[PDB]
Amino acid sequence: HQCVKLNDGHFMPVLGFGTYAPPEVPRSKALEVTKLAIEAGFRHIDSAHLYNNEEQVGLAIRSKIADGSVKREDIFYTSKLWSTFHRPELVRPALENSLKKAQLDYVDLYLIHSPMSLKPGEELSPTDENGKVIFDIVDLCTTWEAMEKCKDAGLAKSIGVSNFNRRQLEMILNKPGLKYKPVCNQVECHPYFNRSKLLDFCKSKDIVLVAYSALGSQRDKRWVDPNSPVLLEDPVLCALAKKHKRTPALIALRYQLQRGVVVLAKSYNEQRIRQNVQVFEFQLTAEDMKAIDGLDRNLHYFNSDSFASHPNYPYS
Numbered sequence: 123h124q125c126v127k128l129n130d131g132h133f134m135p136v137l138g139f140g141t142y143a144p145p146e147v148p149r150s151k152a153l154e155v156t157k158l159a160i161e162a163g164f165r166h167i168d169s170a171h172l173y174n175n176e177e178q179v180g181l182a183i184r185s186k187i188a189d190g191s192v193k194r195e196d197i198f199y200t201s202k203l204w205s206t207f208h209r210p211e212l213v214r215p216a217l218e219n220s221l222k223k224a225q226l227d228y229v230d231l232y233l234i235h236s237p238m239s240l241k242p243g244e245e246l247s248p249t250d251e252n253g254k255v256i257f258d259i260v261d262l263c264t265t266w267e268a269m270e271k272c273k274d275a276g277l278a279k280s281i282g283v284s285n286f287n288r289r290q291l292e293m294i295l296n297k298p299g300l301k302y303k304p305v306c307n308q309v310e311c312h313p314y315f316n317r318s319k320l321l322d323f324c325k326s327k328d329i330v331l332v333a334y335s336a337l338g339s340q341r342d343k344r345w346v347d348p349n350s351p352v353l354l355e356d357p358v359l360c361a362l363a364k365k366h367k368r369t370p371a372l373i374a375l376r377y378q379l380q381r382g383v384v385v386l387a388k389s390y391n392e393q394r395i396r397q398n399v400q401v402f403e404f405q406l407t408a409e410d411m412k413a414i415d416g417l418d419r420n421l422h423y424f425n426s427d428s429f430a431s432h433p434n435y436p437y438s
């Protein structure tokens with residue numbers, strides 16, 4: 123039920139449903155599970171142009187509005203501007219296209235998906251003849267201006283960023299004629315990478331930290347090294363789960379909630395979708411918090427080193 127107030131005065135529900143699924147999963151699944159997530163109790167729905175599912179997710183949202191389950195105002199829907207669209211003149215059309223695909227009039231939240239700008243084209247990851255991705259050099263403050271223009275148009279209620287570090291955040295915050303702060307910064311966050319310093323920064327600036335891969339990544343072969351620790355197998359989360367008679371995933375999500383982090387949970391399984399909303403049903407002790415805090419290994423699951431060269435590469 124709980125929401126946090128955003129620095130533009132809108133409210134963001136603190137538990138969000140992640141909708142990304144690999145290309146293998148049929149697109150119809152995005153429709154089904156998103157309706158399930160809404161039926162379960164989620165009111166915050168995270169998507170993006172990249173995820174190739176905005177048609178299905180928007181259809182689920184429209185279906186739940188139209189069967190009378192919720193109203194548009196109950197749903198907090200997030201889309202993301204992809205990095206082939208960072209040139210300012212490309213920002214508003216991308217949003218419009220996302221809206222046309224999702225069949226909604228506005229998103230509650232529009233994010234700059236990543237700081238590292240790509241070559242503009244009809245392709246989503248443009249690669250040259252050797253298969254290397256072609257970068258673009260764009261001053262992200264101009265991207266931000268185009269984002270602010272989307273806010274004034276009513277196309278996005280709130281605007282924020284994702285995968286930005288301290289430097290990129292303050293580069294937006296120092297911006298001359300800044301009309302709107304980012305309400306939020308959506309970054310990878312879980313017990314093996316808690317972002318305690320980044321989070322403290324944000325709390326100072328009134329920017330919500332939004333955790334993704336907060337259950338430990340879906341562990342795609344393409345992006346994640348399978349030898350990395352499995353977060354939901356962690357001994358301390360398994361211990362706390364048996365102690366509270368919950369599950370490791372519930373421990374992880376509650377961990378974020380109690381340290382003031384809005385947390386995303388992806389699940390395409392109906393039982394886990396309905397289980398994840400029990401995060402509001404129990405609390406961890408300050409000592410449980412301490413023991414999870416102690417798991418921090420500054421561990422990225424998303425291996426991005428073919429982009430280290432990028433001037434805007436987030437964690438240099």
Ligand SMILES: NC(=O)c1ccc[n+]([C@@H]2O[C@H](COP(=O)([O-])OP(=O)(O)OC[C@H]3O[C@@H](n4cnc5c(N)ncnc54)[C@H](OP(=O)(O)O)[C@@H]3O)[C@@H](O)[C@H]2O)c1
Pocket residue numbers: 139140141142143168169235284285308309333334335336337338339340354369371372386387388389390391394395397398
């Ligand atoms: N801004 C960014 O760059 C960025 C990057 C990555 C992700 N995201 C967003 O964050 C969302 C979530 O992150 P994510 O995709 O990395 O996945 P995640 O939330 O870390 O979840 C990972 C896996 O945990 C499993 N799981 C879910 N609930 C569970 C439970 N109660 N018990 C045990 N296992 C459970 C799910 O498998 P089942 O489906 O089988 O349950 C899921 O595939 C994404 O869907 C996307 O919206 C954003």
Ligand SMILES: CCc1cccc(NC(=O)c2cc3cccc(O)c3oc2=N)c1
Pocket residue numbers: 142170172205206235236237238239240426429
């Ligand atoms: C300058 C563009 C650029 C350059 C280098 C890396 C990236 N990052 C990604 O490939 C992403 C993968 C992804 C995957 C699943 C869900 C997401 O939400 C994701 O988000 C991403 N940004 C972007």
